[PDB]
Design a protein around this motif. Sequence first.
Motif, PDB file in Angstrom:
ATOM      1  N   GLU A  25       0.699  -1.325  -0.012  1.00 30.79           N
ATOM      2  CA  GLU A  25       0.002   0.082   0.105  1.00 30.79           C
ATOM      3  C   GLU A  25       0.833   1.241   0.041  1.00 30.79           C
ATOM      4  N   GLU A  26       1.789   1.233   0.790  1.00 29.98           N
ATOM      5  CA  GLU A  26       2.822   2.549   1.072  1.00 29.98           C
ATOM      6  C   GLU A  26       3.588   2.659  -0.272  1.00 29.98           C
ATOM      7  N   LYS A  29       1.325   3.968  -2.891  1.00 39.99           N
ATOM      8  CA  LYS A  29       1.136   5.589  -2.576  1.00 39.99           C
ATOM      9  C   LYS A  29       2.348   6.212  -3.176  1.00 39.99           C
ATOM     10  N   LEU A  54      10.138   4.648   1.307  1.00 46.75           N
ATOM     11  CA  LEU A  54       9.636   3.608   1.812  1.00 46.75           C
ATOM     12  C   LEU A  54      10.655   2.693   2.808  1.00 46.75           C
ATOM     13  N   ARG A  57      10.338   3.696   6.842  1.00 49.26           N
ATOM     14  CA  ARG A  57       9.305   2.824   7.495  1.00 49.26           C
ATOM     15  C   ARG A  57       9.251   1.567   7.337  1.00 49.26           C
ATOM     16  N   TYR A  98      -5.187   7.066  -5.970  1.00 45.62           N
ATOM     17  CA  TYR A  98      -4.919   5.552  -5.363  1.00 45.62           C
ATOM     18  C   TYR A  98      -6.075   4.411  -5.782  1.00 45.62           C
TER      19      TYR A  98
END
Length: 149
Positions: A25-26, A29, A54, A57, A98
């Motif tokens: 998901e990240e 995004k 990315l 995190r 998204y």
Amino acid sequence: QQLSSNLWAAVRARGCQFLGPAMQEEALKLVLLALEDGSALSRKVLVLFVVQRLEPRFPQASKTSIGHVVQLLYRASCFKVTKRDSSLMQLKEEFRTYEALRREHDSQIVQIAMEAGLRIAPDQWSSLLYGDQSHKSHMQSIIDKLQTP
């Protein structure tokens, strides 16, 4: 699950990766962050952009794994590619939000399952792709569109 294992093996067999619901998901995004406005990035620079943001995190992020994520999007026909003698990549206009990009992403994974002969129900898809039971109708909708006679 044997099912999950066979699905991801099928996805990897086609040069692609799904990193897990939270991480993918990240990643997606961040792809959007770079390509929303129609910027045209080489694959190298796109990967670099995404890994850069990315990895803080999700420290296991790599150029190799995010390359495999981008390839999944490529396979889903999400990009307009301008070739040069190093090609440049743009998100197709229809996928610059998204929900839209994620939907095409999931659909490509469902196509892969179909190719691989894996029968998966919406509640399973919701688990596999989102890690919850709140995306059944989303997945059912994707399935309906792919199951036109």
